[PDB]
Design a protein around this ligand. Structure first.
Ligand code: CL
Ligand code: CL
Ligand code: CL
Ligand code: CL
Ligand code: K
Ligand code: MG
Ligand code: MG
Ligand code: MG
Ligand code: MG
Ligand code: MG
Ligand code: MG
Ligand code: MG
Ligand code: MG
Ligand code: MG
Ligand code: MG
Ligand code: MG
Ligand code: MG
Ligand code: MG
Ligand code: MG
Ligand code: MG
Ligand code: MG
Ligand code: NA
Ligand code: NA
Ligand code: NA
Ligand code: NA
Ligand code: NA
Ligand code: NA
Ligand code: NA
Ligand code: NA
Ligand code: SR
Ligand code: SR
Ligand code: SR
Ligand code: SR
Ligand code: SR
Ligand code: SR
Ligand code: SR
Ligand code: SR
Ligand code: SR
Ligand code: SR
Ligand code: SR
Ligand code: SR
Ligand code: SR
Ligand code: SR
Ligand code: SR
Lengths: 237, 194, 92, 56
RNA sequence: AAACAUCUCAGUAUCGGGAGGAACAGAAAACGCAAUGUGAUGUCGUUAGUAACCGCGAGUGAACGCGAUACAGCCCAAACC
RNA sequence: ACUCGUACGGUCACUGAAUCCUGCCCAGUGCAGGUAUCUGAACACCUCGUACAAGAGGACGAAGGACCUGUCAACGGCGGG
RNA sequence: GCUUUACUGCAGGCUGUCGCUGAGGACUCUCACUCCGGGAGGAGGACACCGAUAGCCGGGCA
C-alpha cells in the first residue's frame, strides 16, 4: 500500500513541524556556580506560544535578561532567587535537597543541571514527598512516584495557567488556531474512513476495522495502529 | 642476532596479550576521539611499515584511518524483486574494510599515492589501519631507487583501480594456479565472475 | 492380515529352501553426510531455496508390506515386492 | 476550474533560463541547477549512458 | 523454464570512482599429460559444450596441456655494517 | 521530526453537538499479565564417533507456545429446540 | 491495484549467544563504554549502545 500518516510525520516536513521560528525561548533554569548569590526581578509577564501559558521575563543581578517558567502567583516587580541558599517561596528555584517535604514543585530536572523536564505544563505540579541523602522521591502529575537525585533543581509552586483544560473549544475554528501553534497535523481523518491502500482499517463496504484493534508492541511501523499493546480496553471489568 | 624490529613484530602477533594489550586499551581511547583520517609522524608498527616499503624520508607520509565495523549498509528494494534479490541484512560488500580505508586516506591526500597499509586493531564498533602514502612529485622520492617507480603516470590513483597489495589480494590474484581462472588478468575481463 | 513369523521358502543365497524369519523393515538413521545433505547447505541461503524450500508430501491410504526375509541357516536376508496391506500382524 | 486551458493562464513564473556553463535554456533559476549540463550541482558535466542506445 | 520460487535473462542495462595510449596481468608457497616431465604474464587457435554445476529440469560451463604470437627478467624487508 | 514540547502533554485509534442512555457474552481471534510442570534454537559443556573433522545423542533452556488470568466505548456475537 | 489464518520470502520488533569487555546461580568493584554538567564533577557500568548469529512474531513490504 502507501505509507500511513504516522509514517509521513517522521520525515519532518513542514506540514508536521512545529512553528519553531515563532517560539520564544526554552525555559531552562539558570546555571549558577554556587552560593545562591543570584537574584533577579520580574520585569514582565508574557505569553508562551508553545505552551499556551504565561512566562516571566527576569532581569538578574549580573545583567542577564531571560524568560522563566512561571508558577502561579508571580507578578512584575517581584524578586526571585535561584541557588542552594535561595529562600523557600513561590517562584524560586533550588535543589530538591534544600526543598522541604510536602511542597508542590514544578519544572523538575531529570538529571541535575539539565534545566527542567517534568511538570512544565499549565496548572500542573510535582509533589516532593520524601527526602534523603541519596534519593529524593517526587510524585509527578501522572501520579507516578519518581526517584530523583536530590541534586535535581526545581521551582517552588505550581505552573501558571491552571484550568485551561476546563473550558471546551466549542468550535473547530478554536482548535484550529491552537493547532497552528503546534507541531501537529490537524484535523483528523479516521482510519476506517480511508481506502485499504492508506491504512490497516481502510476499505470495506461499510466502515469498520476488518480486524482487532489491539496491536502488538512488536508490530512494525505502518502496522502499529489502533490500540497499541493495550493491557485492556473499554471501561468495564 | 634478532633485530629490534622483530620485537615489534612479535608483540603484534598477539595484540591482546602483554604490554601491547595495555597500550591498545590506552591508545584506542584517544583514537576514538580523532577524525576519520589522521596523519601521523611515525608508524605504530615500524617493522610492518619498513617491510611494506616505508622509509624515514621526505615525501613519505603515514595516516591512520578508522572505518565503521560490520557488514554492508544497504537500502532495501523499492521496486519488485524475486526472493533472491530481496536480501538486505546478511549481504556484505565485495571490498574489505582495509581497502575502503586506503581509499579514504588517498582522497584526503589527493596528491599522494597509496603504497601499502596494515591493520592496527579495532574495537567493537570500528577498525583502524595505517596507510603509507608517497609524494610522487618530491625529488627526494623521484631519486629513490626503491620508490621512484611510483612516480610513473600509470601509477596515478592506483588505489582506486585495485593496484594495491590489499587490492590485488581482494581481487583473488594471490594464487597463480587453481582458483584464479576468473580473477587473472582482471575481474572485468572474466565477466565479473570471480 | 496375519503373517507367519517364520516359514519355509526359497533363500536366493543358500540357493535352496530353508526356514526364514520375517521382520518389518525398521528405518535406518541418517548420517547427514550424504551428497544431498551437502547440497542443501551449499544451495540454501537468502530467500527461497528451490527444492530445499519444498516440504513433506502426502500419504497413500494403504502402504505396501515392507519386509525382510532372513534365512535361518546362512543368516542372510533378502527383499521381496510388497503388496498393499492395511495392517500386518505376525503369528507368533 | 479545468486542469487544461483555464489553468494555463496562471503560468508566468520563470524557472529554466540560459545556462552560464553550457548555453542551454536549462538553468533552473530557483534551484540554481542546470537540468541539461549539471552546472550548480556538479563540477563534472552531466552525462548518462541512457542518452543513447545501449550498444551505441 | 511454455505457470513459478532455486535456476535463467546476467554480472547484462544502468549507476559511483579511476588510469592510459593502450589498460590490467606478470617472474611460482605454480603445474600434477605423476614425471628421469613443464617452467613469469597476456592473447589467438584448440583442448570442449569435455570435467564440473543444475526443481539433476530448462539451462550454465572451465582448466592443465598442445599449436601459435611475443618473449625478460628484476627490486626491497631482515641478517652483517 | 515530534521538541524553544513534558501527563492541564502528545502520540495511536474509535464514536461524532447538547439531552436521556449505553444491557448480556472473554468460548474463538486480538492485546496484556502470570506461569509449578510440559514444549522451546544457537554458542559453550558432556557421551559416542573421527589419531582430527564431518556426524549421532545428551544435559541446560531465553523469548514464544501449551496452561491460567484480565480485557468488548477489542475484533466481533446475542440462535435453533 | 487491493486482501488474507494462500505459497514463498524480505524489512522490523522481542529473546538467547559471541565479540566490544576490565578487576575482585547469586555478588562487589572501576578502568573501557554511555549519559548529565560551562567546568570541577555527578549518574550509570562491564550492562547499555553497536557488529555477528540463533529462536519467535512478522500483508509493514515484495
Ligand atoms: Cl489540544
Ligand atoms: Cl593512490
Ligand atoms: Cl509391513
Ligand atoms: Cl607439463
Ligand atoms: K526473475
Ligand atoms: Mg525551556
Ligand atoms: Mg501548522
Ligand atoms: Mg475524524
Ligand atoms: Mg471512500
Ligand atoms: Mg493495508
Ligand atoms: Mg462504524
Ligand atoms: Mg459511523
Ligand atoms: Mg586483458
Ligand atoms: Mg516463464
Ligand atoms: Mg518444468
Ligand atoms: Mg553464468
Ligand atoms: Mg589445471
Ligand atoms: Mg640496494
Ligand atoms: Mg459521519
Ligand atoms: Mg550528549
Ligand atoms: Mg502482496
Ligand atoms: Na591520492
Ligand atoms: Na553453491
Ligand atoms: Na512461458
Ligand atoms: Na505468469
Ligand atoms: Na538450479
Ligand atoms: Na603432448
Ligand atoms: Na472471547
Ligand atoms: Na489495477
Ligand atoms: Sr530543554
Ligand atoms: Sr541546555
Ligand atoms: Sr475496513
Ligand atoms: Sr461494560
Ligand atoms: Sr586524479
Ligand atoms: Sr552457497
Ligand atoms: Sr532460505
Ligand atoms: Sr492421501
Ligand atoms: Sr474544488
Ligand atoms: Sr502565476
Ligand atoms: Sr549543489
Ligand atoms: Sr556520466
Ligand atoms: Sr619466455
Ligand atoms: Sr450525543
Ligand atoms: Sr480472550
Amino acid at each position: 500500500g502507501r505509507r500511513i500518516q504516522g509514517q509521513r510525520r517522521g520525515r519532518g516536513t513542514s506540514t508536521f513541524r512545529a512553528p519553531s521560528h515563532r517560539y520564544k525561548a526554552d525555559l531552562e533554569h539558570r546555571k549558577v556556580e554556587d552560593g545562591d548569590v543570584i537574584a533577579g526581578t520580574v520585569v514582565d509577564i508574557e505569553h508562551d506560544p508553545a505552551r499556551s501559558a504565561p512566562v516571566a521575563a527576569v532581569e538578574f543581578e549580573d545583567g542577564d535578561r531571560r524568560l522563566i517558567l512561571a508558577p502561579e502567583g508571580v507578578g512584575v516587580g517581584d524578586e526571585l532567587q535561584v541557588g542552594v541558599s535561595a529562600e523557600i517561596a513561590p517562584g524560586n528555584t533550588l535543589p530538591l535537597a534544600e526543598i522541604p517535604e510536602g511542597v508542590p514543585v514544578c519544572n523538575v530536572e531529570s538529571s541535575p543541571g539539565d534545566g527542567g523536564k517534568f511538570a512544565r505544563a499549565s496548572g500542573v505540579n510535582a509533589q516532593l514527598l520524601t527526602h534523603d541523602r541519596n534519593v529524593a522521591v517526587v510524585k509527578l502529575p501522572s501520579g507516578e512516584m519518581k526517584r530523583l537525585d536530590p541534586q535535581c533543581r526545581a521551582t517552588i509552586g505550581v505552573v501558571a495557567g491552571g484550568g485551561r483544560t476546563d473550558k471546551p473549544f466549542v468550535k473547530a475554528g478554536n482548535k484550529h488556531h491552537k493547532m497552528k501553534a503546534r507541531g501537529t497535523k490537524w484535523p483528523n481523518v479516521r482510519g476506517v474512513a480511508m481506502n485499504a491502500v492508506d491504512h490497516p482499517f481502510g476499505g470495506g463496504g461499510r466502515q469498520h476495522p476488518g480486524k482487532p484493534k489491539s496491536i502488538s508492541r512488536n508490530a512494525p511501523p505502518g502496522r502499529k495502529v489502533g490500540d497499541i499493546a493495550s493491557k485492556r480496553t473499554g471501561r468495564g471489568g | 642476532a634478532r633485530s629490534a624490529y622483530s620485537y615489534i613484530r612479535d608483540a603484534w602477533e598477539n595484540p591482546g596479550d602483554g604490554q601491547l594489550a595495555e597500550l591498545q586499551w590506552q591508545r584506542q581511547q584517544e583514537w576514538r576521539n580523532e577524525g576519520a583520517v589522521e596523519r601521523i609522524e611515525r608508524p605504530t608498527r615500524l617493522d610492518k611499515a619498513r617491510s611494506q616499503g616505508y622509509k624515514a624520508k621526505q615525501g613519505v607520509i603515514v595516516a591512520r584511518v578508522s572505518v565503521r565495523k560490520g557488514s554492508a549498509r544497504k537500502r532495501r528494494h523499492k521496486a519488485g524483486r524475486r526472493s533472491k534479490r530481496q536480501g538486505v541484512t546478511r549481504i556484505t560488500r565485495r571490498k574489505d574494510i582495509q581497502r575502503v580505508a586506503e581509499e579514504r586516506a588517498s582522497r584526503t591526500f589527493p596528491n599522494l599515492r597509496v603504497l601499502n597499509s596494515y591493520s592496527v586493531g579495532q574495537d567493537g564498533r570500528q577498525k583502524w589501519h595505517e596507510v603509507i602514502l608517497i609524494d610522487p612529485n618530491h625529488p627526494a622520492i623521484q631519486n629513490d631507487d626503491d620508490l621512484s617507480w611510483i612516480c610513473a603516470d600509470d601509477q596515478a590513483d592506483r588505489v582506486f583501480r585495485g593496484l594495491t597489495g590489499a587490492g590485488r589480494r581482494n581481487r583473488g590474484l594471490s594464487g597463480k594456479g587453481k582458483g584464479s581462472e576468473k580473477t587473472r588478468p582482471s575481474l572485468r575481463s572474466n565477466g565479473g565472475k570471480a | 492380515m496375519q503373517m507367519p513369523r517364520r516359514f519355509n521358502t526359497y533363500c536366493p543365497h543358500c540357493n535352496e529352501h530353508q526356514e526364514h524369519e520375517v521382520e518389518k523393515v525398521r528405518s535406518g538413521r541418517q548420517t547427514g553426510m550424504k551428497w544431498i545433505d551437502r547440497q542443501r547447505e551449499r544451495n540454501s541461503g537468502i530467500g527461497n531455496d528451490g527444492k530445499f524450500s519444498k516440504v513433506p508430501g502426502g500419504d497413500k491410504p494403504t502402504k505396501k508390506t515392507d519386509l525382510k526375509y532372513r534365512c535361518g541357516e546362512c543368516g542372510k536376508a533378502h527383499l521381496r515386492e510388497g503388496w498393499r496391506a492395511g495392517r500386518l500382524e505376525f503369528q507368533e | 476550474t479545468g486542469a487544461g486551458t483555464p489553468s494555463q493562464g496562471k503560468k508566468n513564473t520563470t524557472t529554466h533560463t540560459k545556462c552560464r556553463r553550457c548555453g542551454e535554456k536549462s538553468y533552473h533559476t530557483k534551484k540554481k541547477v542546470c537540468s541539461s549540463c549539471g552546472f550548480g550541482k556538479s563540477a563534472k558535466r552531466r552525462d548518462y549512458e541512457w542518452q543513447s542506445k545501449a550498444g551505441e
